[PDB]
Amino acid sequence: SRFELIVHQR
Numbered sequence: 001s002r003f004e005l006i007v008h009q010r
Helices: 002-007
Strands: none
Touching: none
């Protein structure tokens, strides 16, 4: 959840 919101920046 949290990680993806961040990783979304790729």
